[PDB]
Amino acid sequence: AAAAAANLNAVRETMDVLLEISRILNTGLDMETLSICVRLCEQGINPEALSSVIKELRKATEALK
């Protein structure tokens, strides 16, 4: 449609705002991980629960390095 591509513009707008907040804090996440984290946080999840995982998976790639 046309109004269905305007909503596909309004999601890129949000994703750019979130991409700005991700860099001015200098997080560890990149844009590709962040697209999974937005899907998780849309469902309703403890953000205290995901961060402990992400704190272990980043040290599990120092168990790969």
Binding site: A5, A6, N7, V11
Partner: peptide
């Protein structure tokens, strides 16, 4: 899925009639 569809070609023109969703 949304970020996969999100890479669509979008016009670089922005409307002068609409500031609310100008694609």
């Amino acid at each position: 899925l949304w970020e996969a569809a999100l890479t669509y070609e979008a016009s670089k023109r922005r409307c002068w009639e609409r500031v609310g969703c100008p694609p």
